[model samples]
Target: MGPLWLDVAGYELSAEDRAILAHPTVGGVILFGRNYHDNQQLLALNKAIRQAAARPILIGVDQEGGRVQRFREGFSRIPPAQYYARAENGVELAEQGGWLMAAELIAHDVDLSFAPVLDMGFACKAIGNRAFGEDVQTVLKHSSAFLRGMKAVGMATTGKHFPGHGAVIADHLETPYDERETIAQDMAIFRAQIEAGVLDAMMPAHVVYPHYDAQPASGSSYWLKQVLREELGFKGIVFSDDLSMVMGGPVERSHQALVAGCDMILICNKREAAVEVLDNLPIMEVPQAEALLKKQQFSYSELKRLERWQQASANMQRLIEQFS
Candidate 1:
């Protein structure tokens, strides 16, 4: 199978979506605000996709706290990322809060969360409440706690948009601007996340670092093969950001991302592009990739996280009711 791509809820699932999933190259789904309704409806939508696939499908959402949350209202109104940083106690309490939140997502049958935003984009509106802080140490601690929380409930998690989306002034949703300067300080920030061992998967940012990768990180050989996989020793899955984004470039965006070393390509807004990418995947042994397609079986027990979560959940619930 290729790897995870996407299909929108309102759009008709063309022959391409079906063909792509059948291709064995496609791996998972990334849910967006466009794909959701209420709990029951959302569950059904996820169920239908899983049922259609032969392998267990990875159902995911960008459910990071604050404005990045895809499901709200009925779900926990998770505090902004900085709320964890500002607490008098260390981020353990926030970590527990993260677990509680992820537990709710797993309860609804979603398999993964693109969460615990690791980008320390403290001043960027695009990264606003998503950043833990400007401090790399704080970002690392909070992210580790957040991942532990998600894993506790049998849900996988992804850290994004790496090797940090903090410096970007241009938004991938619209314009593309190549403007980040590379420095050892930035490398140290990402190294902290890798050392924490909290990241199960990662999505590279579209912005380019001239000193690191000539191409946008999502479509650059240097970023994926050299920096992320080699220097960082990240052996986990890597998903490219939505190929439909302007920064992703032309129609062959998915193929370019794959060749650039992304384990999976997210064609979030373009089903046809996904099909083409699936068709062109190299005929090679993707055993590691196949293993990735299966449910993520953690090497460590999750009970510690669950126990921590039970305590944190009580606190979160109290806060919710008290505020209400």
Candidate 2:
């Protein structure tokens, strides 16, 4: 499969959308709020997506709960990560929350979730409630538990905004400046998770560490190739944040991210830009790409009937109500 991942326009795939997904350069589909209605519709949409791609394609979402969840009506209302950090039984809640989220996605045929925001809370505007806690150790603890839960349910985890995005208050589209000391601390949080075997993928931030690199990590080979892959020994996939928001235009950003060592680059919410990426970028094969496909033995029908799903669903509801 190729390295470019793009999004669909609506709940069902259009001929144009189908053709785009069928393109040899496209490797994945990312579903958005606009692409979902309910569980049955989502399952049908996923089936169409699978049919559109000749190979086993990755289907991903930002189902990290709180403000980021894309499907809400039939799905559980998962609380923000901070809720788990504050709850008396935070560790267990984090695990159950991870399981509940992944199980629901698996039942609907989604393969991956960009989850367990590893950025330590340090007043980052975009990362506020999404982070597990302010302390690196606490973030590590809750995120690890959450990852364990996802693994228990057969879903792979992608740790996001690598090196760290928690200190920057600006919109991620803008370049961020952080002290070398702070960046190293943020790197430590991700290092702990990687060492624990909790991460299958890593999404580098669009923010820059000026002292380290003039370019953001997503566009910096120094960070992606050197610090992340070589120094950290991460054999997992490295994904770029949306190509549109990176330092350059879509095609330029795609080339930069790929050359910097991103196994996959996402171009979402913009069709013209996505096509630009498809037309301009070269195919970059990634090792272990097939490992990202959903491998759960349970079918959607079976998932609905399973006692574990029923119990987990019920528990999720209770937590939602309690947290609300």
Candidate 3:
């Protein structure tokens, strides 16, 4: 399989997308709102693609349970991540909740969820409700929960927006944010998750940390390699967010992201850009690629999460109906 990229819209795999996946350079698939439907359809969709691939496709989603949920109407809408932390109001329950969330996703065929947002939203609208909470302990509580959950289900988790995307107000789509202060303080949360060992993958934010490094986290070898791998000792898959997002910079910027140290650079919608990334990325050794692919977390225990569905459902229904 190739590194990582996505089809635009719910744009099903065409000859081009199929050809791209067939390339020795591609590795997985991540679905968006454009690629979803009810559970039955979603399962059929995944099965159809898997039939064509040689290796296990890294099927993923952005199903973080709040406004970002990609498969909501049929699935339960767990509260904003922070809400769980608050309701639990402590570490133990919060961690349990996180695992529960991961398990639920896997029973539905999702192999990974770009979740347990480590961003610590500073009231930033985009990331606000998404983050678990503001402090290190709170964030850890929730992240631990998610890690355990994903592990339970035999799936993997990608702790996201590394080195922090909170504390600034840059809309990744419209504004180029350059955070220049307290870079060390910002990264403490991610460090906590790394040490916890629940993080199987990471997605660096697209914003630039002017003081920490000139390039955005997604494209900076300084951040991805030096700090994340060397200092923190993370040895798992690292994916760039949407290469098509403004945060990913221009098309040339996507090319640079791969060169810089990103394991898999994602170009969500644009086929042309995806192909270019595929063509330009230096090929990794087949054995090495296989080893990295093995880093994804998958466990049978996570499937036990299905047993908790009735409770999860009642909680979701009670809360969602209140909103309605």
Candidate 4:
């Protein structure tokens, strides 16, 4: 499988979706609220898409809870990372959520639940509650716990909006040059995560830090290679944010991001653009992604039947009550 990640239309796969999944470049699928109806529908859709690919495929969702939680109605309600910061025994409960949310998703046959946002989450509306905390230590403490819980169930933790997107006001727009100090503080969380080995995959921010690089973090070699790889020593997958989220069209963006060191390029629902990249982009492989799919902790039936999952289900209610 190649390194492109895409999306589906609704609760089921269309002929086009199937065809796209069958493409050699398509490595994974990220689901949205539109693709979920209930557990049965979600499982069926994921199963069908996996079968349609005829090769290894990962089904992921933005199940970070709060506003980003995509699969609801049937999936257990998970609040934003900030809620964990507010709840009693914050660090402990945060880890529980990392496990609770992950275990539930695994039970639905979802391979990844992109989670434990590592941002400081204070100033940016786009980041908001999705981030774990407002300071480096707080974010570090809880995100580390959350990531541990995610790993407890074999879910790969994918931290997002790298090099920190918390200070910017523009959403889905090219970023103004943030000061070097702010960039330093924002990246501190990433540094700790990397040093601690809790971070697995990461999605880059579309925001460009002129103080650091001209291109967005997703497509900047200075950021991805020089800083992230060289300085911080990140060896995990560099997941590019939705290519459409940046200024350039997907085709140009995809090429640049790969050259910049993104292991997998995410091109959300921008179908025609996605087709263009799939048609023209050179063949590439992310062996890490291939390795990830094989690390399944438990099958759906086995996951739900476990006493650990059962305990998490009860604790989930308590956490929800505290959030409410």
> Highest TM-score: which candidate?
2
Instruction: Rank all candidate structures by their lDDT, best first, as comma-separated numbers.
Output: 2, 4, 3, 1
User: Model 3, which residues run further than 4 Å from truth?
Assistant: 88-97, 170-175, 178-180, 246-254, 279-282, 285-306, 319-324
- Between candidates 1 and 3, which one is better according to lDDT? 3
Q: What is the lDDT of candidate 1?
A: 0.67
How many collisions per candidate? 9, 0, 18, 2
Q: Compose the digit string of candidate 4's lDDT tens values, residues 234-320.
A: 988888878775446677888888889898888987888889998988787776786456255555677778787677667766677
Model 2 C-alpha lDDT per residue in residues 14-92, reported as the tens digit of each score: 9999888888788788888999998899999999998988677899999998878999888877888777877778888
> Which number leads on lDDT?
2
Clashing pairs in 2: none
lDDT of 1 by residue, 1-324 (tens): 446567655423445455555556656777887777677777676666666676666677778766677888566667666667666654776677677677666666677777767787566667876787777777777777766766765565677777777766655334344465555554576677677666677888877676655687888888888889999998778888787763344335655777889887777777666656656655433445443332433211253255555567566655445433
List where candidate 4 sits over 4 angstroms from the true fold: 170-181, 246-249, 297-301, 305-307
Error of 4 at 115 (Å): 1.6
Model 2, residue 283: what's the lDDT?
61
Give one digit per residue, the lDDT tens place, for model 3 in 58-120: 677787776787877556566667676655343544444455556655655566677768887
